[PDB]
Amino acid sequence: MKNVGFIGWRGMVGSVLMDRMSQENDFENLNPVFFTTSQALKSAFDIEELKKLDIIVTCQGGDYTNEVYPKLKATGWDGYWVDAASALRMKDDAIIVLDPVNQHVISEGLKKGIKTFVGGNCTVSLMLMAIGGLFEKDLVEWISVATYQAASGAGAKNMRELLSQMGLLEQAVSSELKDPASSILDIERKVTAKMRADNFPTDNFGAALGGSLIPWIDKLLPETGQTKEEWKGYAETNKILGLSDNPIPVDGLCVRIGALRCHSQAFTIKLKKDLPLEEIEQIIASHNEWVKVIPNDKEITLRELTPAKVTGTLSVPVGRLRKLAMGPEYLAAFTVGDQLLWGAAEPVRRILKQLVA
């Protein structure tokens, strides 16, 4: 069987990949070779040991990829490079994977001779897993996005900082909260003071996340005024769908909120045609087996459409579906999906499964 190498398997995204692969018994269909960057297992920088492999799966990061990949391709290596990092997504000899949405694009690349397959941006992947049916029927003119992004997208230290921040905000008023008759304005004054204090751990985010939000993710791109995260909305959605010759506009604001691992998104989707709400609900629901249409009811939305419910699951619920006041061609949609799964480890796990078949 196929000889597969794994790099960055001990990190957060890598650990979710290892766990999901173990759960689905994916190691039974391949010969795994584990790599490490440590000088304390084979070396991840040994080009000759990597040349022996048929497939390479890396969750190590962009800095590793930009160093090792060109050296390995310069030796004449004919194998497959599977990456979770952004580094190679926008290359001509690379395809962005998300098989329940773009199986036809992947299959055509496997025929053409493309050897580099990269997992897509979290926010973009979770969006496409939710409203993919609409894109399959070419019913989307444009999408306006407003995201509610989790700390896991920024890293492991970032999740820890959020949790530490949440603790200090409560601990600043712990006794006052246990007193049923205490002043709310006094309580708030104290947590806001702790949030603004010098000793408040803001090292990883550069601002407070717990009890707040940060309307900026990744570096500024002077060209459009977007952040790299917001830019990926237009750039990646179209490369995944293969519609780079006829680009469908996807833009908006990417905001970091106090959630652990689920990214949630508010959409304003402009449709090309006027279809009834019941027909749109079926088109969304029938695309894939993970998307779930949550009815526009209070009790069900509170139980289903939240980070609380979807964390650690493969389920991609989409709700709050209705027509907007600016015309029956404007659709409202809210989705919640796990960042580490469909937004990181799952598309990577799925393309590997296909390559070793």
Swiss-Prot record:
It is an enzyme of class 1 (oxidoreductase). GO terms for biological process: 'de novo' L-methionine biosynthetic process; diaminopimelate biosynthetic process; isoleucine biosynthetic process; lysine biosynthetic process via diaminopimelate; threonine biosynthetic process. InterPro entries: Asp-semialdehyde_DH_CS, Asp_ADH_gamma-type, Asp_semialdehyde_DH, NAD(P)-bd_dom_sf, Semialdehyde_DH_NAD-bd, Semialdhyde_DH_dimer_dom. Substrate binds at residues 149, 229, 256. Changing residue 232 to R: 2-fold increase in affinity for ASA, nearly no change in affinity for phosphate, and 30-fold decrease in activity. Its EC number is 1.2.1.11. It catalyses: L-aspartate 4-semialdehyde + phosphate + NADP(+) = 4-phospho-L-aspartate + NADPH + H(+). Keywords: Amino-acid biosynthesis, Diaminopimelate biosynthesis, Lysine biosynthesis, Methionine biosynthesis, NADP, Oxidoreductase, Threonine biosynthesis. Phosphate binds at residues 89, 232. NADP(+) binds at residues 10-13, 37-38, 60, 152, 339. GO terms for molecular function: aspartate-semialdehyde dehydrogenase activity; NAD binding; NADP binding; protein dimerization activity. Disulfide bonds: none annotated. The active site is at 122 (acyl-thioester intermediate), 263 (proton acceptor). It holds the Pfam family Semialdhyde_dh. SMART domains: Semialdhyde_dh (SM00859). Changing residue 229 to D: No change in affinity for ASA and 82-fold decrease in activity. Pathway: Amino-acid biosynthesis; L-lysine biosynthesis via DAP pathway; (S)-tetrahydrodipicolinate from L-aspartate: step 2/4; Amino-acid biosynthesis; L-methionine biosynthesis via de novo pathway; L-homoserine from L-aspartate: step 2/3; Amino-acid biosynthesis; L-threonine biosynthesis; L-threonine from L-aspartate: step 2/5. Homodimer. Belongs to the aspartate-semialdehyde dehydrogenase family. Consists of two domains, an N-terminal nucleotide-binding domain and a C-terminal dimerization domain. Catalyzes the NADPH-dependent formation of L-aspartate-semialdehyde (L-ASA) by the reductive dephosphorylation of L-aspartyl-4-phosphate. This is Aspartate-semialdehyde dehydrogenase. It comes from Haemophilus influenzae (strain ATCC 51907 / DSM 11121 / KW20 / Rd). The lineage of its organism: Bacteria, Pseudomonadati, Pseudomonadota, Gammaproteobacteria, Pasteurellales. The gene is asd.
